[PDB]
Write a structure and sequence with these properties.
This protein is of the alpha/beta class. The chain is built from 9 helices and 12 strands. Bound molecules: sodium ion (2 copies). One sodium ion binds next to helix 6.
């Protein structure tokens, strides 16, 4: 394929390489064809590159789920189509039960496999989306950055920007937190970070004048968004710094997609994002788990009807470009 990278704001959505996932509230996530994904998701993350069976070896790979009933050829064409629309398709490394437990020395083979898949499917980059147990498993903190540097450099040689993103759960981004080796090793290689501001229950931050602001408090959601992002983009309040032009706010699509973190009132995001913009530090966009959930159903089989991309797609795409 042709490496197709993002120079302006993004709306990121994950795409499930499986069918009929059950939700946190009993709903259903269909498998969907790439070509059915709403075009306002201009970064689509194929979930997941993983180890399928450890008897196959330590190096994760990607195998298109045959239940989805696309041939490799048809999947590849759909990626070419997205690329022709100016949209990126990343491979998301990790996910639940991925069995990624790499040993020092594995970076060469992991880099070779990323390059292979990239060239074959026409992926535009990789998203680091490790499960909690993987973040510090074995030599992952060393191997995964070492491999991605070699991948970045390989594609830089041919004038291509192989995108590198990550999806840390936000508690792991405290200063010296478990995800910080990935961030420091890959500083100047990663394009943007899309943390998960969901599934962390009552984790949060204390702000003098406001109080305790939890990720699951729907009365203080503007405050949560504004203050957690302000902390990250400035490296304050004991958070690792991620520059504002490289921070994308990750969210559940609806209450089926995650246990906690769903934004009940989209105006809380609009206002938080406008406060960050007004101080000269606008964010790079939003991300969601997941496009399948946005296209999914509740427990009564009522369609979620793309509400996430309705709420946020125009809002983000009509912002000024970065820099
Ligand atoms: Na591509
Ligand atoms: Na509120």
């Amino acid at each position: 394929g042709t490496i197709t990278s993002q120079d302006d704001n993004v709306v990121v959505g994950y795409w499930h390489n499986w069918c009929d996932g059950r939700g946190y509230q009993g709903g259903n996530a269909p498998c969907v064809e790439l070509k059915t994904v709403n075009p306002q998701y201009n970064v689509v993350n194929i979930s997941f590159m993983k180890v399928y069976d450890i008897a196959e070896g330590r190096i994760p790979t990607f195998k298109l789920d045959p239940t989805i009933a696309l041939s490799e050829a048809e999947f590849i064409a759909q990626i070419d189509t997205l690329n022709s629309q100016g949209r990126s398709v990343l491979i998301a490394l990790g996910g639940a039960d991925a069995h990624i437990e790499l040993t020092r020395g594995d970076e060469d083979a992991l880099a070779a496999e990323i390059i292979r898949l990239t060239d074959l499917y026409g992926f535009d980059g990789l998203d680091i989306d490790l499960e909690q147990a993987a973040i510090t498993a074995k030599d992952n903190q060393f191997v995964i950055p070492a491999a991605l540097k070699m991948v970045k450099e390989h594609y830089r040689k041919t004038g291509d920007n192989f995108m590198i993103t990550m999806a840390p759960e936000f508690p792991y981004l405290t200063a010296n937190g478990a995800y910080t080796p990935y961030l420091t090793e890959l500083d100047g290689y990663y394009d943007f970070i899309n943390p998960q501001f969901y599934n962390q229950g009552g984790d949060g931050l204390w702000i003098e004048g406001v109080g305790w602001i939890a990720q699951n408090n729907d009365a203080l959601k503007e405050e949560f968004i504004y203050y957690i992002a302000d902390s990250l983009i400035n490296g304050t309040r004991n958070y690792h710094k991620i520059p504002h032009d490289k921070l994308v706010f990750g969210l559940p699509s609806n209450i089926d997609a995650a246990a906690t973190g769903y934004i009940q009132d989209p105006q809380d995001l609009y206002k938080a994002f406008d406060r960050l913009k007004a101080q000269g530090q606008p964010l790079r966009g939003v991300m969601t788990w997941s496009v399948n959930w946005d296209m999914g159903t509740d427990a009564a089989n009522n369609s979620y009807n793309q509400q996430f991309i309705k709420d946020y797609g125009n809002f983000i795409h009509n912002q000024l470009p970065p820099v």
